[PDB]
Amino acid sequence: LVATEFSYRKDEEIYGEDEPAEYVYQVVTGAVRSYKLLSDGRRQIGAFHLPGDVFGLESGPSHRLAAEAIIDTSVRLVKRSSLEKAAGIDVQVARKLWAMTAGELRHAEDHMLLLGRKTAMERVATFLLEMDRRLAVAGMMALPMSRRDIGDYLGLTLETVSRALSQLHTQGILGFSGARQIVLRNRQRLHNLDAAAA
Amino acid sequence: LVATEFSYRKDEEIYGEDEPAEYVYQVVTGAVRSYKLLSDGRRQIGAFHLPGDVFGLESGPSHRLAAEAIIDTSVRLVKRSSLEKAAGIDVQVARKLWAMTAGELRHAEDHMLLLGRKTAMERVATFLLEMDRRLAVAGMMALPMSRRDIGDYLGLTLETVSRALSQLHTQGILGFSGARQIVLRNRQRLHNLDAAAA
DNA sequence: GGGAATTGATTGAAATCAAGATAGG
DNA sequence: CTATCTTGATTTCAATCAATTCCC
Incomplete structure (x- = not known):
């Protein structure tokens, strides 16, 4: 009501x-x-x-x-x-x-x-795609939670999450404007790092 | 209908x-x-x-x-x-x-x-307790599935599941009458190996 | 007899342990 | 300033690789 x-x-x-x-x-x-x-x-x-x-x-x-x-x-x-x-x-x-x-x-x-x-990278790629779909604004995700919350969502430690994000950044797949402001630069590449349905 | x-x-x-x-x-x-x-x-x-x-x-x-x-x-x-x-x-x-x-x-x-x-042991103890509640007859579980199905339910390999079951057997926590016929001998001890809620 | 299960040897991916660097308040 | 985050060193638990053994 x-x-x-x-x-x-x-x-x-x-x-x-x-x-x-x-x-x-x-x-x-x-x-x-x-x-x-x-x-x-x-x-x-x-x-x-x-x-x-x-x-x-x-x-x-x-x-x-x-x-x-x-x-x-x-x-x-x-x-x-x-x-x-x-x-x-x-x-x-x-x-x-x-x-x-x-x-x-x-x-x-x-x-x-x-x-x-x-795998740890598949989980992080899944997470980034889910957040991009749910909260991206004009291409950029302003993530509200800490790396420890992301790890506890994904069954991982915050250090492993950080390392996967660092690697994705080095490869040019995402951009950072501070740690929780993330811009996906190539969703297709990131989709290829998640695991695919049978 | x-x-x-x-x-x-x-x-x-x-x-x-x-x-x-x-x-x-x-x-x-x-x-x-x-x-x-x-x-x-x-x-x-x-x-x-x-x-x-x-x-x-x-x-x-x-x-x-x-x-x-x-x-x-x-x-x-x-x-x-x-x-x-x-x-x-x-x-x-x-x-x-x-x-x-x-x-x-x-x-x-x-x-x-x-x-x-x-942990792997907590998962296996959780699984045995769930199956005991759902399928035990006069104390014994006749499990219908393979070790590989158990591992794929628990996010583990069948070898890890086998090892945990072997260990529970050696400690006197369960009895076997063949691999898939299991008798829990001490449910309390097994409950103590699962993880407890906060 | 033969898929299933156990058991052993070894590898490996992520956890843990430990400094620093970053940047929000 | 102080959490949070990154990065490095190392350990560990479960995976993988590899024979046997046990039963259906």
Whole structure:
């Protein structure tokens, strides 16, 4: 129905893993990471949510990943129960909720293949192409997250990510204007470094 | 509504990647693997579907993973269009379909953490515990798949999986009655070798 | 009998350990 | 100024390469 606005500071938790899934959120400005942790501190980031993306939608009762703002972020949010009510009233709403979860599933399925099977360079080339599609403006990606967040998204250390980016820069495949301002100079070459579907 | 029966031989493809998602399936007997391939032959298994499990449900128009019988398998299946009609007629059907996809998402989220962050031994212990919960009979797991399928589910080589299983055996954690007949002797010790949540 | 599994030897890609260089605040 | 990022040195865990052995 009606959304309400809210903002979170860089690094503020928006919800925790296993916390009640009481609201559903949409990024207006900024960026959010969703992740799971192990007890010794190892962290897998499952997804980055960028402006316009919806997150926190759960069919069940609890958030299965924690979510934190990467940088100061403004979101819109709606009560989960308000969505459940609308879905009951309107077959089209119910179908759109399922579609949202299905798109999350498709992203996770592709991401399992990356984490289980791709080389470090393939993973970084995949990542740069995904970000270019999602956030490039007039050819340039202003990436909101650190090298440690990129590594924890890709199942790699930040040093390996840095090394792959350095190599791509030396080869003329990308340009830098500072470490997180990246301009892809040849998407085709970079596409050739990811792994290809059978 | 009305399900029909069908069977597939060991290694027969049930549907391909990117193929039209025309039917939804439930294992009655046997076992199925869902996977994605890369062009050089590398393979990530996203899930094993065991008796009673439903698979091949897509919100979108096509299968995002291929599916193959691991051993001779009997399934029940229904037309996807038949499900879409029931879901339009009944709010609880629509809701169950969303819940199915959401359970697949929860599995894939956990599995990303495993593929991105768990050591080889943690992955194998996770796998044995998952299979014990889903398929043990009076304490013993008759695993339907090869070591190569296990490694492709866990982002490991079959040799690494063999070594971890050998080690668990030598430590008294599991028993063998042949390679794929496994009896967990101490689930607590094995749970301690998986990695724990924060 | 023969694909599957175990086991051993070795390599290798990414992690870890360790300085510096960079550049946002 | 101080995190973040890059780069280098070295280690390590799992992969790869290579025979046997065990069972279906």
